[PDB]
Design a protein around this ligand. Structure first.
Ligand SMILES: [Ca+2]
Length: 227
């Protein structure tokens, strides 16, 4: 039921160096504020198709976490910032916009439970027929990028860099990259009574499988959406 193969993540590591292309596009950052539990907060940032930062936020309350992540977004030169607003982050817009005062950085609340972005467009049968919600939509955007990258790196099959995803291992750091990978391979499909793609929530993953909230993975997933 897992949607991402570890082998794709290994292939995607420094894929831009292996295949000889460079980061191009906007810088997109996202923050997962976790919940009211012990689990670490998450932050991810990419420049176009190259991921450059994966960070954990420890021993922070909700507001400290938002200060931490918005400051990272500024440090990373983000053009766009998103954060998970489905839970405890629902009230963070004011603080987030304050943090970005006087800077050209957009702030977008991401709610994974919403119907998919652009749900009436054809799937490439509509996007809304295929994905239950934005959480599924953008995790599969991530999975699709990773698979194309795997096929390019390992099977020599051409793909547009814009449709791939590379992890800049030197920029990210081995330890955090490994933490991210360990979470990504745990993201799982759940049964859906309308035949749509749907993923387990963190709460469900905790209950069935006893694994902590994958907040690095979720942060990376959210930065797949560029406002
Ligand atoms: Ca989340």
């Amino acid at each position: 039921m897992a949607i991402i193969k570890r082998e794709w993540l290994e292939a995607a590591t420094d894929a831009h160096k292996k295949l000889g292309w460079k980061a191009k596009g906007a810088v997109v950052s996202a923050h997962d504020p976790s919940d009211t539990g012990p689990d670490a907060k998450g932050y991810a940032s990419r420049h176009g198709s190259v991921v450059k930062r994966i960070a954990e936020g420890l021993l922070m309350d909700i507001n400290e976490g938002a200060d931490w992540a918005t400051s990272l977004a500024i440090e990373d030169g983000a053009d766009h910032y998103l954060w998970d607003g489905d839970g405890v982050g629902a009230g963070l817009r004011r603080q987030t916009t304050e943090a970005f005062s006087g800077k050209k950085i957009t702030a977008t609340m991401f709610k994974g439970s919403e119907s998919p972005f652009d749900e009436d467009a054809p799937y490439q049968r509509t996007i809304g027929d295929v994905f239950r919600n934005k959480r599924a939509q953008f995790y599969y955007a991530l999975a699709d990028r990773l698979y194309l990258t795997y096929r390019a790196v390992v099977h020599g099959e051409y793909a547009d860099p814009d449709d791939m995803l590379s992890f800049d291992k030197e920029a990210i750091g081995e330890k955090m990259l490994e933490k991210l990978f360990a979470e990504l391979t745990q993201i799982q499909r759940k049964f859906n009574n309308n035949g749509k793609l749907e993923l387990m929530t963190a709460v469900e993953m905790k209950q069935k499988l006893g694994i902590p909230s994958p907040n690095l993975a979720d942060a990376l997933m959210m930065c797949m959406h560029c406002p």
